[PDB]
Structures are given as structure tokens and as C-alpha cells.
Symmetry: D2
Subunit: 222 residues, 4 copies
Amino acid sequence: SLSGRRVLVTQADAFMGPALCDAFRAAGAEVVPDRSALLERGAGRAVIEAAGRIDVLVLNLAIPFPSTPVHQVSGGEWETTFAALVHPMREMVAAVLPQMIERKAGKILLMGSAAALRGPALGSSYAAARGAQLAYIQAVGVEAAAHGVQVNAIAQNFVENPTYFPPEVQATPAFKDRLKWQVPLGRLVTADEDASFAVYLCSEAANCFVGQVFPVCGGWVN
Amino acid sequence: SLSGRRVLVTQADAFMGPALCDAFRAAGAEVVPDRSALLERGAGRAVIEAAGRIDVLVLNLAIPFPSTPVHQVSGGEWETTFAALVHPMREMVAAVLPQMIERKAGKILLMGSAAALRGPALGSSYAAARGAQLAYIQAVGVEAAAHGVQVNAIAQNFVENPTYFPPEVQATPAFKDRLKWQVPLGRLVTADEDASFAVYLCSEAANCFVGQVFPVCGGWVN
Amino acid sequence: SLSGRRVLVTQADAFMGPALCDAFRAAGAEVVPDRSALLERGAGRAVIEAAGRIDVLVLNLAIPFPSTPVHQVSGGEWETTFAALVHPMREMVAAVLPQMIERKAGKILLMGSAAALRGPALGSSYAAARGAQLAYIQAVGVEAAAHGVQVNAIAQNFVENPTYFPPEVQATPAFKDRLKWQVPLGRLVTADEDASFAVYLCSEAANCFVGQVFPVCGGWVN
Amino acid sequence: SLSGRRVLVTQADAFMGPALCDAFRAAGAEVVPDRSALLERGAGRAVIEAAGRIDVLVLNLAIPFPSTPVHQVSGGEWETTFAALVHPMREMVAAVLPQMIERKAGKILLMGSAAALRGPALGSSYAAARGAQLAYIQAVGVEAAAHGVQVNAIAQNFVENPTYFPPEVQATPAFKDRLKWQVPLGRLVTADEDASFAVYLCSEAANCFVGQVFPVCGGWVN
Ligand SMILES: [Cl-]
Ligand SMILES: [Cl-]
Ligand SMILES: [Cl-]
Ligand SMILES: [Cl-]
């Protein structure tokens, strides 16, 4: 039971935010659903500082999937991708660790992307940002293990959510075929399956997981 | 809740068997703790057939870790390793799937070894058998996903258990150093952490996992 | 240059054998193309012993891809799969290592399968055998590194060869679609690309690779 | 033979640059050894544009390994790490692809880091940048495969080179022990082994490799 624990969930209305908030409420936690814009220097530090005590930080972060060929990407599209997905992650982790290290206890979970694990044919700058996320979480988890703090990542794809798999995507035949030929599960991971796994990864039972990346994508990548 | 579900656990007194049985009892399941010897042709089929209805099959299988250099291994040591770890796994999976396919529901979990994922310097025939286990579970999970049956594997090492990490091993300095230099967790995974993860992997929340190998080894392998 | 080196290639008329033999001839090696049946106990030891000095052992091993659902596989089909792919590999490695250890030099390369890395929907017993191969080669490579002997594996799929990708397979529409949706390369790896990589892995330049599995499958698995 | 081919190697005096330049000269290529500072916006585009025809782009990029705990890293140290390792990689790939796509032929090889694959206990911002590199190269390789261009990465560690493994590091006892307990090879990969593998990956024999990450670290990671 995550009873009387404070769980902050970023971009709570987007990506996995809704399901995460529901799931952490049902487990009995005090959920702080942050909707702040995170693009500006210092914004992520501000979210953490405004919250006071954090027991669990769930980095739910997302942008629309860019469609740009790799040679026509601007330096600005690139730096926007990293300003949305990468720089806030670092600000928030660095702001929240000190209190978890002091308490010798705490949970950080990244809701990252399997596009860092299996290259896409059009999301080159998206894939780069998501890879920065995964490698950072790995390194921070190894660091923080020494202090009793667990930092881990989900690497997901083909999960039902409004940002990357809304119904309009699901109706396209390209998606139909991507499921047939690439997803052994043969269906989308439901938002609630994903969020229950997140809850497990933020429980004491999961104190043995430090710096680990868990793929959640119906067998699309293993 | 795994309420009124039948969970069969092989070699229940060895390796992870005790912790698994405790954990599945606490989740409210009817636990069948099998202690049969499995070496003989047909023995594993007999265990499954004697049990009648299986909702969850947990393949807890183990032998002592052999110390033999690769060029001095006999054909008989080899075939004994496979007769203990591999052939019973196949008999039991093939015996239990038909009822799970008919019910369009069921769970198979292999308690396998990370030695299949990171080569050891002396367990060549042990590592081969454990690799057969992992690749089989992968293939069977992809097959059975079509029928609503989830077949997955834990790939573990550095978990507290009497077979591979009894106190005498823990006192040796080679182990002291293996933890220091190879296990980011800095301690053994407890038997109960491992068994709780097994329970989660055999719950409905985990219906999204088919044919997946989950490393459970404190960051020894990722 | 592999000049005046003896390179033994098993099942030389099947799978990658032709291309391997051509490629190792062109690099200037003395190629021993073995066509022996390997099913019987002792057959693989006999091949190695008949050859005298081996500098490079290339374990090219294959059987037809079985089509059997996992629950209808017989114990005999299973043990035949392992008798063709697994037990000869062990006999031959254990027979050839002593002379390589004495010379503090030598190369063993397994031509294995990516089906051990990504579960297939019908090759459950084939996938198990191929996984035993990969995990064994990993463990033996870690052992033999101490002696200056390099033991490695290719894990291949979607390579042009008469056993798994003859023209009749290539014409089917299921294959057409498997390439479209699963092989980033968009074509089969040619036999000569595969064999050149094998030659590189058996050169001195590759003395840094011990117990490593190299996927060769056009991005099907990474 | 890489005869009469132009091969540009970035930071040619640092990291793997010397060995790469020697190795590509010996294979008969016209080597362009660039020593430019790459930190400024547009600098990498300038290097590519000044070179005219590029047949092979070898992204040799490096900075000193930072020693900073994750919670004391400044936003500026972070953005400097990415400005040295990540933003120039993108500028140079996007500048050089158009001519390779037009020629339906070309090679890009990243000299990346296994620290993206196995989290370090102090290089959190270094690990993040190196992960961005690997995921980007993966995505670009999948994109460019359609055009006959091969984009791949080496993910290395424990290679002899002045930047990360100079003699002073090699004498420390922490390194002594890291080899003993973590590197199955039991020695450093030589610079020339690493560079020969780079040359192979930029040859036609390697046209089957698109978007693939090859670990080169003596078995430290697999
Ligand atoms: Cl998703
Ligand atoms: Cl264990
Ligand atoms: Cl193949
Ligand atoms: Cl290095």
C-alpha cells in the first residue's frame, strides 16, 4: 500500500498521466497532478520546489511525434525536442533527489519510449531525446542505489493513450499491419496495465530494481 | 487477487520454491507444492496430470552449479543437466497448455537464470541449459499470446536462496567482491522481492506480458 | 590474411557452408569442408579427431524449420532437434579446445540463429536448441578468453541461403510482408556479406571479441 | 579496399582519431583529419561543407569524463556536454546525408560509448549524451537504409586511447579491479583492433548493417 505517500505526476493530462493518477489514487496515495508547462529553464525545478515533500516522482513527458526526415530537421526543432523531454527531466531529478537521499528512500519512474530501443523510420530527433532519457535514468539509478533510492524507467510503445495511440491512429491500415506483424501481444497495452506496472515499480516490493529499463510494448521490443 | 486459483510450483523445497509458495498463498491462491523428482521421461507430464486444473504453472527448476571446465565435461554430465532443467520444462508446458488454451486464460512463469544472458567462467553446460529455457519460453509466449495465455520468464541471479546463495557462499571473499564490482544493487535480491515480482507476473494486471524475459539480478545484467 | 591456416566447416553443403568455404578459401586458408552426419554420439568428436590440426572451427549447423505447435511436439522431435544442433556443438568444441589452449590461440565461430533472440510463433523446439547454442558459446568464450582463444557466435536470420531462404520462400507473400514490416534492411543479407563477417570474426583483428553474440539479420533484431 | 574514397574523421587528435586515421590510410583511403572545435552552432555544418565530397563520415567525439554527482550538476555542465557530443553529431549527419542519398551510397560511423548501455556511478550527464548519440544513430540508420546508406555505431569502453584510458588510469588499482571483475577479455581492446572494426563497418562487405549498435568493450557489456 502506498498509503499517505505523495506522488507527483508531470503533464498529468497528457500521455499516461490520467491512468497513472487514477492508479496511484487507487493504491491509496496522495497524488499531485502537475499540469505546468516545462519548457522554460527553471520550470521543472519550480514544480518540485512547490510540491514540498515528494515520495514518488513519475516523469510522464511527451510531445507530438515529429514526421520530419532527418536531413530537413532544424536545429530549433531539435533543441525544442530536448527542451521538452530531456532538460526538465534533469532539473526535476536533481531537485528531488536531495530529500530522498536524506530519507534514504524514494522512487523515481520515467515513462520513456521504446523508440530509444528500436529505431523508427521518421522520429530521429524524438528517438535521440528518448535515448537521452533512458541512459540518464540508468546512470542515476546506479548512483542512487547506494542511498536506498530506486530510479527506473518504463520503455513503452503500443500503449493505449491519447498522445500516441488515439482512435484515429488505430483506424489507419498502417497501424493494423504494424500490430499484425510487429506486436506479439496482438493488441495495445491498456493504459491501466501500464499504470499498474508503474505502481508496482514504485512499491517497496520493487526495492530490488535500480537503474533498470523495463520494456512495455507487447513484445514489439524485448 | 489470485483467489481460488490453483498454482503449481515445481521443486517446491528448492531454489525459489519456499518463497514462491508463501507469496502465492498470501495472495489467496490454492498452492500445489510439488516435490517430485523430474528426471525420468514422463515424470513432468505425470505431475501436471495428477494436478487436474492448473491456473498458474511456476517452473521452479534447479541443480547444483557445476564447476567443470568446458573441455572436461562428459556427455553424461551434459545430458543430466538437460534432463533436470530442460526436458521437464517442455513436458510440463506441453501438458498444461491445452487446458489454458481451452479456457483462453492462464499463466506460465519460468524461474530461469541470468547465466543465459551473461556467460559464466565455469558453468558452460549449466549456461547452455538455462539458455534453452529462456529461448523456449520466448517462443511459447509468442505462440500462446494468440490464445490469451501469458508465458514469461524471470532471468535471475544474486537472489537470496539456499541453492545458489546460501550463507557459506555469502561469506567467501570472491562473493564479497562480486557484489562490490558487479551488482549495482549492492546486496542480494531478497527471496520475497523475487517472489512478489513472480506473483505480479501471474496476475491479470500482467496480461500485457507475453514471451518476455525479465532480468532480476540487482543490475548485474540489464 | 588467414594464410596456411586450417579452417574446418561443418555441414559444408548446407546452410552457410558453401559461402563460408568460398570466403575462407579466398582469404587464403586451408579449408576442410566436412559433410559428415553428426547425429550419433561421438560423430562430432570423430570429425575433429580426423582433422588433426584445427586453427578455426566454424560450427555451421542446421535442420529444417519445424512447423509444429508447441503442445503437439513429441519428446522425440525435441530430442532430435537437440541431437542435431546442440550435442554435436558440445562434442566438437570440447574436442578442439585442448589444442587451441595449448597453442594459446584459436577461433571458434557458431553460425547460430536470431530465433534464440526473438521468439517465433512456431519454432518452439528449434528456438530452444538455438538458445542453448548461444548461451553455451557465451560461457565458453568467457572461459577460453583466459587462454587467448576466441569463441563467438553470429545470430542470424534473413540471410540468403538454401536451407531457410530458398526462392520458394522468397516468393510467398508472407515473406514479402515480413521484409516490409520487420527487416529495416529491406532485403536479405547476402550469403557473402554473412561469410565475410564470419571471416573477420576469425581474424586476428577480432582478438578483442570473446564470448560475444553478433546479430546478423538486417535489423530484424538488434 | 577503400581506394580513392574520402573519409572524414572528427577530433582527429583525440579519442580514437589517431588510430582511425592510420587504419583508414592503410586501407587506401583519402583521409581528412579534422581538428576543428565543434562547440559553436554551425561549426559541424562548416566542417562538412568545407570538405566537399565525403564517402565516409566517422563521428569521433569526446570530452573528459565528468566526476559530478547527479544532484550537483549544473544546467550549464549539462548543456556543454550536449553541445560537445550531441548537437555537432546532428549537424554533421544532416549536412552529409544529402550527397550520400543522391549517390545512393555512403557510410556514417559513430564512435559512441557503452556508458549508454550500462549506467555508470558518476557520469550521469555523460551517459545521457552518449545515449542520445546511440538512439539517434539507430533511427537515422533505419531511415537511410531505404537509400543505400549505412549508418551505424560502435559502443565502446575499455579501449586503449589517451582520452579515457591513458597510463595514469591504467596504473590505479580501481582500474586493475575493474578489469579483473568486469572485462572478460582481461585486457584493454587495443586502439588498432577498434579501428580495424571501424574500417570493416565502413566497407562494402558491411552493407548489410543499418542502424546497428556494435558493443566493443571486451565483454564488459554484451
Ligand atoms: Cl506508447
Ligand atoms: Cl539466483
Ligand atoms: Cl538465416
Ligand atoms: Cl573507450
